[PDB]
Amino acid sequence: EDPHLRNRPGKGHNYIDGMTQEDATCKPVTYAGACSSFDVLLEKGKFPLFQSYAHHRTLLEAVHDTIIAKADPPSCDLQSAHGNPCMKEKLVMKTHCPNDYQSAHYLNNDGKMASVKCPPKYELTEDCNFCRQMASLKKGSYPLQDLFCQSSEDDGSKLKTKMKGVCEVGVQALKKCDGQLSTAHEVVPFAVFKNSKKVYLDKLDLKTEENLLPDSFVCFEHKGELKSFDISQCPKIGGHGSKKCTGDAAFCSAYECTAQYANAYCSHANGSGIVQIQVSGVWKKPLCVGYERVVVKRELS
Amino acid sequence: EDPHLRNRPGKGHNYIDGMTQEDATCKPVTYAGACSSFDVLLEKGKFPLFQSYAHHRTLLEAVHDTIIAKADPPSCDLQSAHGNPCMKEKLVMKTHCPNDYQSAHYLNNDGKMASVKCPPKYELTEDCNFCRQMASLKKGSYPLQDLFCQSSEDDGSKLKTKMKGVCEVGVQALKKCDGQLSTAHEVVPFAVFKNSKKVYLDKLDLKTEENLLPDSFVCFEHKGELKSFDISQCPKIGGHGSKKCTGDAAFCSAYECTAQYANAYCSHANGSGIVQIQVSGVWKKPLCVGYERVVVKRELS
Amino acid sequence: DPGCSELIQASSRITTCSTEGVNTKCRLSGTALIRAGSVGAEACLMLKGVKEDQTKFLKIKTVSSELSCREGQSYWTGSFSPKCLSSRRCHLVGECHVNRCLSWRDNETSAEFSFVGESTTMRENKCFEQCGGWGCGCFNVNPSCLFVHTYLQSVRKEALRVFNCIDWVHKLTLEITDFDGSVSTIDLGASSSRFTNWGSVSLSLDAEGISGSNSFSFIESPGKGYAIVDEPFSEIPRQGFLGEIRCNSESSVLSAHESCLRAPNLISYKPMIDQLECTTNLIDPFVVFERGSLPQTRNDKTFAASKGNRGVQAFSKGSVQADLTLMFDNFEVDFVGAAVSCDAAFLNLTGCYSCNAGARVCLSITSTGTGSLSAHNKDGSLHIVLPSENGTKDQCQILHFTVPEVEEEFMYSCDGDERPLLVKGTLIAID
Amino acid sequence: FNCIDWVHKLTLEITDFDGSVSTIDLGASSSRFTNWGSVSLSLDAEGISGSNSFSFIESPGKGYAIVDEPFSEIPRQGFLGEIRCNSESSVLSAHESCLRAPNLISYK
Amino acid sequence: TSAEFSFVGESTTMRENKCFEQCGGWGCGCFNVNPSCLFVHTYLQSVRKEALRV
Amino acid sequence: TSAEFSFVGESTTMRENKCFEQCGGWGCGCFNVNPSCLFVHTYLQSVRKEALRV
């Protein structure tokens, strides 16, 4: 298929300290260059949420855009056993990859970037929890979660876990209990507000408005690398503006198209712009809603 | 499915006496192993009981488990004269023996490993009672009985055959029949406890009571086919044992995962538990229960 | 309490003795007949070998008269709670057509809800259209669409099983004691058969039943008491009826499995452009379970639950008249002649006469060895068997008589020699 | 629209502990998720039966109405509801999603 | 014929094969959350030693 | 047509063949414990030399 989703808006950087030596071809992310930390997010039948919201940012890109900070340590050390910073949050999570990886990133409870690290030449397991011994050695970070990145200024750091009726979900201990718990690996979403913690989600009710905002489009440089071009500079219909732009019927129906006499190419996107969510009966704008298969200990007896 | 057909927990040694031609490939029993005394046990349309109870023990594996002693002699000759221990218990058999076989092991009345062997290179006949001149010849023996064992230790020296209304069955002299003996070949089960005699049964009632037991886990080596690895070498959490062990979330939740310090991979398995037997009403733990086709002499009147 | 009220001798046609190891044993390859005892009474079976002292007995202890129910069409039910999920998209965007959501199938995962996960519950997918324009945040002039993805989950920690009874089976819990002393507690109803160590047994005569049971539904609670509802069995599950959402197993209700049944077009919705509140008016069975909790008073019977074995019963206040068929599957009965002594003494004799109850006897058997004691009268109609051991213990059983002044001479022994014994006691008239 | 059963609805104005005012409503056994939890009814009474033979008409921003005739089931000629639609926009813009009476538009 | 009782044989004795649904997980004796099955192989046996021709 | 009575065949008479179930064992003169059979080949024939046409 046409790799039109590789054009990431903003910076588009996917590299972390410690390992991953493929940063020379993935900084930024364009057509040229291969990277195992992003080509696996475009294959169908894996993460449909990221494919539906592929017009925004990722996790590492959100870290490089001054949105998500970096935890300490940013790379978990698997050489020392008997517990290490990055075991309670991963052991309960159920992931899967096509093997041949060394690094893997996910989200922590604080809200920063907590990843692991596999020293050469050690291979991860089939689930990415532990490690093993030794095809090719992909030093890229395998996406463990299915979240995205977006810019927002709505404050909301006074909300904790909204789930009710669950004893201990993930790593957050909401209440104590020593009885029988319905231990089962369920798919529970999560979201992070402006400088908040790992806020679990009991239900997902997204909201996307299709307007003329630059975040709702992916207008790039007209060809006949590619970054994020401001759509506000495009002239209106029956008027005059600054720069020139062109597109198809969805873009030419409201603005002006000059075909080859344009410096940018605008096009309509699917699922992009202001993304809201329902929480405590009040609409709020998070920073990235994802999914994870953590251990959910529901009440029983 | 059934990913635990050839994997044998615990010991897993199918060594036979006298027919010493498979000592190189027989100990232990892996997934890609070769042994004529185990391949026919999983054949479609032969021994359904072993196919249903695959995650257990056999006869030779029970002999090598330091719980069942061997007979003297363990391998009797078929070209003897008078006083052959493998004659009365062998001629009363009924299960047809396949071709290309020389040795045939079974269970005696005392509860020991009894086997027969003809002079090279004479194979068995149709009934397996005699021998005759010689695909290729197998390098092992053929199990004459469809029985299984487990990790039990209850005593059964006071329990005898509970076959009521039966004159003489197999080779045991029960009671004295008053009427005419009715010779008929039927299927009568048997049961052998820890150091006891061959206790026959009439209505076999086997139940399974699974619980958190260490026998419900397997471990296979990595591959940058499958191999064999003992699961009993994995200690508890926060400790150190003999060999290193590792796994996923289910195996790491109870045992300590050494990540890359091991050479296997623990996975969540089952099919074990504690199997009970219905003997005289009181539920006991069997040790050598199965089925044997012998000659049953019932009363005609 | 022991005490065989009705005693019969086995026929010689099915009684063949033998000899093996200085012991005279015999087997039974037939079936005898004996009257069923009442509450407290028993029904022994005298077995004779080749002579007089070799005599065995098979006591069958009767608990009480019960009327079990026969379960037919059963189903599990419980409370649930839906969860509405809204996702509005613009028109002509992917699958945001106003005509596709009208005929949208429930078993079709839309493109906006393919990232839910492993949801093996009672899920469905609808499609309600809304408005468009720039007033609700839409770029196209055509109206937008709102995708609906609501799945049912279980919120109650327990459940209930609603069933019925097509007929009241007169079940009798019998405690059959073998010849050697093996105690086995079984049950027999109408003409049902079981499986014992001595063969098989089945109830013969049965003249007790309760008519009109199809118009009564029963509710079983895990561990707690049962229930009864005065209504016929639930037919088709429809809206506004007790039992509109059913399943097949307890796990199908405690986990809300998709293999169960539910009423069509039952989950209501509140189309509010972007908001959605899926609420259902489910019937709460706990109200009926609390209003009609066993035990209750129904006509002249007492409906209650049952201990040990799960099932509904019906306590009656009538007589006990039934027959038992002791089928022996060719089982040998051995006996060893003891040689220990035993000096027994009489204590008291209370009870009644001319009734199915009987009279309790008190005997102070003092023996020096572990064995068995056998007693009999003179004409050959009464037999008393009591265990004996080293020490002084007080035993006895239930005896039947037709005279308030019992003056019958007994002949008890423990090794071979028989000594006389006289009993006495004043009884009362008990019907 | 019509009405198959009259549900005793009570509009409640729940005030939280901090001072936030929230106005909701309850009916029969429905529950609404709030800030502190959820609220629902437990016992209802006073019901009106026999409402299937009446149809109500709703107007946008004007009011309701009542009609003394059974509810329109199938559209036909000479009856209320000849050409129906699914939504208001489908009627103001004449969309193909609505239904109409067969052979209704006459010709000369 | 079920695989859990195929060792009996396909004889002329009156037999029947049923199938009931139980529970799953560690609450009864399994590993998966899906409910388990119950293989039933009931066969009839003669009780009376004589027959009657009505 | 039975094998024991093959000397008759499908003749032009009112012939018939049955197979009754009998006991076995050494008490009736047999070796196998399975029940034996009873081959019966009964045919009809005229008695007198005068017939009637009703």
Numbering used by the authors:
A (entry chain C), B (entry chain A): 154 to 287, 290 to 379, 393 to 469
C (entry chain D): 688 to 1118
D (entry chain F): 850 to 957
E (entry chain B), F (entry chain L): 796 to 849
Sentences reproduced from the published study:
Rift Valley fever virus (RVFV; genus phlebovirus, family Phenuiviridae) is an important example of an enveloped virus that harbours a class II fusion protein. As with other phleboviruses, RVFV displays two glycoproteins on the lipid bilayer envelope of the virion, Gn and Gc, which form higher order pentameric and hexameric ring-shaped assemblies. While the Gc glycoprotein is responsible for membrane fusion, the role of the Gn remains undefined. Virus entry is completed upon Gc-mediated fusion of the viral envelope and host cell membrane, in a pH-dependent mechanism.
Localized reconstruction of each of the four types of the Gn–Gc capsomers (pentamers and hexamers of type 1–3) resulted in four independent structures at resolutions between 7.7 and 8.6-Å. Imposing lower than six-fold symmetry (two-fold symmetry for the type 2 hexamer and three-fold symmetry for the type 3 hexamer), or no symmetry (type 1 hexamer) gave the highest resolution, suggesting significant deviations from six-fold symmetry in the hexamers. We first performed fitting with the localized reconstruction of the pentamer at 7.7 Å resolution, followed by fitting the resulting Gn–Gc heterodimer model to localized reconstructions of the hexamers at 8.0–8.6 Å resolution. Consistent with previous biochemical and structural studies, this fitting verified that the Gn and Gc assemble as heterodimers, which form higher order ring-like pentameric and hexameric capsomer structures on the mature virion. Domain A of the Gn forms a ring on top of these capsomers interacting with domain II of Gc, occluding a surface area of ~950 Å2. The Gn–Gc interface is formed between the β-ribbon domain of the Gn and the hydrophobic fusion loops of Gc11, which are shielded from solvent at the interface between Gn domains A and B. Surprisingly, unlike the rod-like array of extended anti-parallel Gc dimers predicted from the low-resolution modelling attempts, we observed that RVFV Gc forms a kinked conformation, not previously sampled in crystallographic investigations of class II fusion glycoproteins. Interestingly, the embedding of the fusion loops was only observed in the case of the pentamers and not with the hexamers.
